[PDB]
Design a protein around this nucleic acid. Structure first.
Lengths: 225, 215
RNA sequence: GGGUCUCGCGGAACCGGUGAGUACACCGGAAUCCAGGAAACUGGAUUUGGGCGUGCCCCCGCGAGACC
């Protein structure tokens, strides 16, 4: 029925441009106002811009004024966000949302699209290096050992991590990635296992990074001698 | 020309069946076009309340909104398991809109001390000239935790980063990694690496250590 | 003729409020005139198109023109 579908997100270097589109289905944007709201990774919602498509009236957050232009084409039932002079701080999921009525109203933003991801960076695509987090020699907290893999220096997001080709899921914690000062991402994935199984069971972390077309399998074993 | 909403608290711990109240104060504007949204990880926000007190069609009536002067309140009368989420208030006027900073509603449980583990850098990583030391806090509650790195008993500053899992869907605990990053040259200049963990579930802080090159 | 457009000339001043969501509906101060009172005031009559970003826009009436 009612749909808003954002598109046009992608990777761009600082200073570059992107044009986002927001295509409506099941209603006419001329009967609504249309709003762009963005969410930086791990942060809150930030209003970006608004338009009354029946009138062409536009408004902008101070953080984007003079760099972003919002527009609409009622015959195509689509709204746009032209983004110029992009900075790293503009990296975010960009949502499009509608509010009932052709001019201002006190209705809410009652339907939101699923968003389009915008990444602003000078970093070059890079597959991760995968290093073992070897289990320690003492049978650790509670007769259980902790082990893992360090997934370091990749760009862009995301990576997917599994253990034993998905055969091991319980006790696994794959942490959210952090962006390093190098512009590259890093994360760890860990798992706790019975101490009595370190000699018998082998543990392998499987790391896939689609943007680099790389796939890595890393056996994590106790460190010896 | 922006407007502002101040939302509090940033986080709250509650149990199923609890009454929950979240507040946003308008700074500049006095517009009553205040709406409340729910957002779950990886999903778009959903509208709950609009025009400060109107319940959106389809939303359970345990959600309600009210206004007293500049203060706007979202109330959940009896919290349900599907209501643990982040909530945002929002204000609009003719041209500008703004959002509050958000409130995460998480699951209350008994205090649980972390299990601490420390990992030296692998021989493989050292070949490329960098060393990463990793400290793991496993399955603790509440989320607040302090991790301090010491190298040869000297406190470290500015060369570590951490990240935390979402609250576990089965035991409601958190886990945290702290990664200390050194050059290979710096790493081989020192002997004892330790992370000291401070948490409400520990009487005194806990230290896990290793000596570079030891068994 | 009717539609779009364009241009010209018109559509009392100020302040605030209610409900909208467009550019509307309504309300109170108020203003002008008359009468009463020493005055504070009182009675009667008449009265402004609107939106919000306040300098731009929409609408209404009259006139001129362009294009279907």
């Amino acid at each position: 029925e009612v749909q808003l579908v954002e598109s046009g997100g992608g990777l761009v270097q600082p200073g570059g441009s992107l044009r986002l589109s927001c295509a409506a289905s099941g209603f006419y944007i001329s009967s609504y106002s249309i709003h762009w709201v963005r969410q930086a990774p791990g942060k809150g919602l930030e209003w970006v811009a608004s338009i009354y498509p029946s009138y062409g009236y536009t408004s902008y957050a101070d953080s984007v004024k003079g760099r972003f232009t919002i527009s609409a084409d009622t015959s195509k039932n689509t709204a746009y966000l032209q983004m110029n002079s992009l900075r790293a701080e503009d990296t975010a999921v960009y949502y499009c949302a509608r509010r009932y009525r052709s001019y201002y109203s006190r209705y809410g933003f009652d339907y939101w699209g699923q968003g389009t991801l915008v990444t602003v960076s000078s970093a070059s695509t890079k597959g991760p290096s995968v290093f073992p987090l070897a289990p320690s020699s003492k049978s650790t907290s509670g007769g259980t050992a902790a082990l893992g893999c360090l997934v370091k220096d990749y760009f862009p997001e995301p990576v997917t991590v599994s253990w034993n080709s998905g055969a091991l899921t319980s006790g696994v914690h794959t942490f959210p990635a952090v962006l390093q000062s190098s512009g590259l991402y890093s994360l760890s994935s860990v798992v706790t296992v019975p101490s009595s199984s370190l000699g018998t069971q082998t543990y392998i972390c499987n790391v896939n990074h689609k943007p680099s077309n790389t796939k890595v399998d890393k056996k994590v074993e106790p460190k010896s001698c | 020309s922006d407007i502002q909403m101040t939302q509090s608290p940033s986080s709250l711990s509650a149990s199923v069946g609890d009454r929950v109240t979240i507040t946003c104060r308008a700074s500049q504007s006095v517009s009553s076009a205040v709406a409340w949204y729910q957002q779950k990880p990886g999903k778009a926000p959903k509208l709950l309340i609009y025009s400060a007190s109107s319940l959106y069609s389809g939303v359970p009536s345990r959600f309600s909104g009210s206004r007293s002067g500049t203060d706007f309140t979202l109330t959940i009368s009896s919290l349900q398991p599907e209501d643990f989420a982040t909530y945002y208030c929002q204000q609009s006027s003719y041209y500008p809109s703004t959002f509050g900073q958000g409130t995460k509603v998480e699951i209350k449980r008994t205090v649980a001390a972390p299990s601490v583990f420390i990992f030296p850098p692998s021989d493989e990583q050292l070949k490329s000239g960098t060393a990463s030391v990793v400290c793991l806090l496993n399955n603790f509650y509440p989320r607040e935790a302090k991790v301090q790195w010491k190298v040869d008993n000297a406190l470290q500053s500015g060369n570590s980063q951490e990240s935390v899992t979402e609250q576990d869907s089965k035991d409601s605990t958190y886990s945290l990694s702290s990664t200390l990053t050194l050059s290979k040259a710096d790493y081989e200049k020192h002997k004892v690496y330790a992370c000291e963990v401070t948490h409400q579930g520990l009487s005194s802080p806990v230290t896990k250590s290793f000596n570079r090159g030891e068994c």
